[PDB]
Amino acid sequence: DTGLLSGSEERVQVALEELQDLKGVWSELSKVWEQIDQMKEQPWVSVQPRKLRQNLDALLNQLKSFPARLRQYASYEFVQRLLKGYMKINMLVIELKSEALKDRHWKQLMKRLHVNWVVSELTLGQIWDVDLQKNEAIVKDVLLV
Amino acid sequence: DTGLLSGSEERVQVALEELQDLKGVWSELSKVWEQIDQMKEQPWVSVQP
């Protein structure tokens, strides 16, 4: 018998508590991920942006659901900035259902984004995966003309 | 004594069974016209014929 390493015990305790916290975080983040991916998967050129915006608010509610223990995490801030991401989706939103969305417009923005699309399925998850927050200049120029 | 027409209550219970069957029928029909409503609501984005 000797002085047992209470440092090891407290390490185990903090690992366990942070583990449960991160598991709740993963549950919330998985729900966010599935909902946003299911949304943006569709081209969304036939759906008012407000049908998107309410999801935004729902996402906000989810971002407000958990206590402050997650709200101090880098994942929380990342999701909040991806909440600004959903806000600039609300931006684009206007281009997707705009009358200016034309075949020549399609091809010109296609060259700008350098991506390749199949017009039959407007999988909006891909169009967001081409980050508007990253390619803002080219998409804004394409919006202008 | 009050000999009562129990056939009234027999009709009551028959109507009850008919009502339960119709409740099941209309639950299924609620699902059906919800799916129809889901369609009727689709402003139509990429849905295929």
From Swiss-Prot, chain B:
Compartments reported by the entry: Cytoplasm, Cytoskeleton
Role of this protein: Cytoplasmic dynein 1 acts as a motor for the intracellular retrograde motility of vesicles and organelles along microtubules. Dynein has ATPase activity; the force-producing power stroke is thought to occur on release of ADP. Plays a role in mitotic spindle assembly and metaphase plate congression.
Domain comment, as recorded: Dynein heavy chains probably consist of an N-terminal stem (which binds cargo and interacts with other dynein components), and the head or motor domain. The motor contains six tandemly-linked AAA domains in the head, which form a ring. A stalk-like structure (formed by two of the coiled coil domains) protrudes between AAA 4 and AAA 5 and terminates in a microtubule-binding site. A seventh domain may also contribute to this ring; it is not clear whether the N-terminus or the C-terminus forms this extra domain.
UniProt record similarity statement: Belongs to the dynein heavy chain family.
Disease link: Charcot-Marie-Tooth disease, axonal, type 2O: An axonal form of Charcot-Marie-Tooth disease, a disorder of the peripheral nervous system, characterized by progressive weakness and atrophy, initially of the peroneal muscles and later of the distal muscles of the arms. Charcot-Marie-Tooth disease is classified in two main groups on the basis of electrophysiologic properties and histopathology: primary peripheral demyelinating neuropathies (designated CMT1 when they are dominantly inherited) and primary peripheral axonal neuropathies (CMT2).
Binding partners and assembly: Homodimer. The cytoplasmic dynein 1 complex consists of two catalytic heavy chains (HCs) and a number of non-catalytic subunits presented by intermediate chains (ICs), light intermediate chains (LICs) and light chains (LCs); the composition seems to vary in respect to the IC, LIC and LC composition. The heavy chain homodimer serves as a scaffold for the probable homodimeric assembly of the respective non-catalytic subunits. The ICs and LICs bind directly to the HC dimer and dynein LCs assemble on the IC dimer. Interacts with DYNC1LI1; DYNC1LI1 and DYNC1LI2 bind mutually exclusive to DYNC1H1.
The name this protein goes by in its record: Cytoplasmic dynein 1 heavy chain 1
Species this chain originates from: Homo sapiens (Human)
Lineage: Eukaryota, Metazoa, Chordata, Craniata, Vertebrata
Gene name, Swiss-Prot/TrEMBL: DYNC1H1
